[PDB]
Amino acid sequence: VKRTYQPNKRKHSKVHGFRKRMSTKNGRKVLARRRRKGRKVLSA
Amino acid sequence: AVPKRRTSKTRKNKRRTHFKISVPGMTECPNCGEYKLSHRVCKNCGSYNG
Amino acid sequence: MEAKAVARTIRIAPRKVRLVLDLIRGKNAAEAIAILKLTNKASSPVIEKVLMSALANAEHNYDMNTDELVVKEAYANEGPTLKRFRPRAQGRASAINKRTSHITIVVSDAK
Amino acid sequence: GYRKLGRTSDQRKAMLRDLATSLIISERIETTEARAKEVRSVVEKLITLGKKGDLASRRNAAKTLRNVEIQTALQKLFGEIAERYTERQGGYTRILKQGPRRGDGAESVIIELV
């Protein structure tokens, strides 16, 4: 049975990485919203 | 099926009446001096001599 | 006098130890030792070591003769359980209690 | 059958050939009571073949032993094991109870050649 999560490094960093979030305008807001919370992992 | 209703600690303690073990059924070996199981060998230093 | 010995947080369920503690409660000392030696139960060696400890405290801690003592008391209380799990079918998961016990033995010379 | 031992017919026959060979090699082995009551009837019928001593007996005994070295287990039979019981009739083994064992509570016996 093929499950929903197949791990992959390139896709993970190319969709959810810092550069991808710091690229668009609602990704800078995600970082600005995760920094305020105090999260120790902003993007990965 | 599921129990319809809880079991008292009277019913439980009654039903555990015959749930026990018995004394091992042992004799005294007339060489070792110590105790042993009848028809088995002397687990202490010794033999059977049957 | 009475001597006593305890073994705390023995890792055996208490109602498995109470089965073999009931065979030796009341008997003599050298008889109870052979009973604990010649029984199939897994809790026999533990109770045997606790009984030998209570028989050894009597010779040294309070001087008395070890050929007269009788097992005056022998019981097992509960102790802190351990909480483990077992993952069953369809995502569920059931509990597992790893019980422990405290075995106490008191030997007296009848005086 | 005579008595089953939790093994299927094939695994049981193999286990009995194994046990009888080990017994005639070492001459006293520690096993379980229920198997000691079954090797009793398989080793005693091999010493009868060893006491007959024909060539048809070597070949009808070769089909119940295993091929292990020591001599071979078939040469120890027809030699020493068959020379010492040349006047004894029957009762070539003896089983002794030792007691239950840890882990199974299975009565472990010793069986040897009398």
Place this chain on the structure above:
RNA sequence: AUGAUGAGGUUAAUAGGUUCGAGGUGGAAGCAUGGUGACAUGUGGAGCUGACGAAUACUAAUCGAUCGAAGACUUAAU
């Protein structure tokens, strides 16, 4: 099912083996002879044989330990 209930525990036949039979299969290994050979024939209804009948202690039921009575009171009769 387990126990229980039956046959027995050395002053013994209860089981296993071992000797002898019943029933089963169907004529063995080895050798000899006849064939180029596959094979056939002879000794020998042979030889193998779980549970069935008889006998024999050869081996194992050793040594030993537990439970279990002294018989209530009235009345009539003798």
Place this chain on the structure above:
RNA sequence: UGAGUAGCGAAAGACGGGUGAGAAUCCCGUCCACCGAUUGACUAAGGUUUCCAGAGGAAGGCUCGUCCGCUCUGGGUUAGU
């Protein structure tokens, strides 16, 4: 409480000798058994120290464990192609 109840996850092990407080379950050995267009050999993802040697037995291991993919202590990855 249900209750010492259901289960203990497809399958062939037997003995000998060790070690040890303790062995059906650990180490060595002989016999047997299983796969063999695969349960064998090599590598991409993906895991990320799980690899090795010396010690350990509280918890994990559906039992045991003197053992381990677990705990402790020291190590191990070498490019002009």
Place this chain on the structure above:
RNA sequence: ACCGAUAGUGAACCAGUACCGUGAGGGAAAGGUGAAAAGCACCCCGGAAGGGGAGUGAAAUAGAACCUGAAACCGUGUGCU
């Protein structure tokens, strides 16, 4: 004329962390020996764990599973039935 560790911040603790999700995001639970560590030298049973003494202490059912220690629940002995 605010709370007093189920309260008061989600967080009196090394918490926005174990973790859980592909991700945006969600989110706990965990306080207290003693006045001073004076935190049990030494002897005995045990392989160790754990005890029983003897000592520290005003107190050891104060021994780091540390103030007090209750109810459900689990046992051991017994008076009447």
Place this chain on the structure above:
RNA sequence: UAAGUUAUUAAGGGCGCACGGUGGAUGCCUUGGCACUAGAAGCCGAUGAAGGACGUUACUAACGACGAUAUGCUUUGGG
């Protein structure tokens, strides 16, 4: 002999008390929170920000402090 009546047994159970275990309520305490008052202050950044990664001690796993001058340096006052 006869007729009749009655009792001890407790495998186990019920109630009452004595002594233990479990578990962590309650009492008392507080390293920290909540809601406010009066007075500073109400921006930092291309001279490289907020926020972080990696490192630094005789050991160092982590937290604070710090930055190849690294568990910190000089100098002027307090002590």
